[PDB]
Amino acid sequence: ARDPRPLRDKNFQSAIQEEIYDYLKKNKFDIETNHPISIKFLKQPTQKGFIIIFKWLYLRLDPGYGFTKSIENEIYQILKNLRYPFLESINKSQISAVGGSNWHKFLGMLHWMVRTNIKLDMCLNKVDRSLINQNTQEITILSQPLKTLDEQDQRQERYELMVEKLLIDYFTESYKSFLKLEDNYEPSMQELKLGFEKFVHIINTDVTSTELKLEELKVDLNRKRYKLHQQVIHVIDITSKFKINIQSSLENSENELGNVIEELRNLEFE
Amino acid sequence: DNLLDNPVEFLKEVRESFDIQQDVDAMKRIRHDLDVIKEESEARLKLYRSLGVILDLENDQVLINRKNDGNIDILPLDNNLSDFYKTKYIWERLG
């Protein structure tokens, strides 16, 4: 609800005046627009020069913006869209003449814009680098040591994305030429052919890898099955030998004891 | 092929030829025969027991107990004549 920055502090005002001045001078503000920049001007400014500074800064944040005929009537909306964290602390009536008693709120607003501009440039630089990095992710992942299908089946969608990015490059460039009344796209087509050859090579490696794995699984299954059958032979060989051997023991004992019983019952005197 | 035409049936046939009841029934008859030998030997074995001739087949000797002491000499069953020899010892040491 309130601005936490010490806007009234004269040391703070002296500091941010330097920081605003330094950035504007370094980035050719006083040259791109004929208005010169000075610590004194930021000490107490003119309304005309303030709008020049605000417009110059915001265009560095939003270059396509079309300023209206009376910039004072859209500064509040611009800050609302910018999501200025100290919007509530600034009343729409004082934007008309900022050089008055409330100038500290607008000096602080200008400093925040300078800091946003500085930070936005770093953000966009990181975004640029990310785009370059994302253009190679697939060929980098797809050319890693290949794993079995049980842990990479989304591989197909990675291939399709790589080919789609090639076509996106082709048609994006061709369309630029088309809007320039140009009709020859052979440069872009030759570029697409070369990138597509990369795709063919890497997936050709997958075909050969998978083919070799398939012919080798055949050998491995043949060996495993033979070993398993030998295991079955062993079970049958000694199960049968077990049963027949005990059958022999049972048979011998019964004839043994039968002969004993005959002797016990042979009461012939002779 | 050095393989099995049908390993599943092969094993199944062995199990179906693994007659359990036949061997169990055999054991019943063997146990029955032991009871028959025991019961039909009992009366004779006690008459021979009252003679004092007690028998160890755990340890390869024969005992004689017709002198009111356990000091009567034993006879091994191996390397002996028995031509009026084993019978003679087990009749001359007997009251």
Binding site: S240 | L4, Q22
Partner: peptide, 28 residues
């Protein structure tokens, strides 16, 4: 070539079956 172990094992199976189906007494 000489994988006749199967016949050797099947000979045992056939012996066991013949013992199970055997009827002791037989006349004429």
């Amino acid at each position: 070539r000489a994988a006749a172990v199967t016949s050797t094992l099947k000979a045992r199976i056939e012996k066991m079956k013949a013992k199970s189906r055997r009827e002791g007494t037989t006349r004429t």
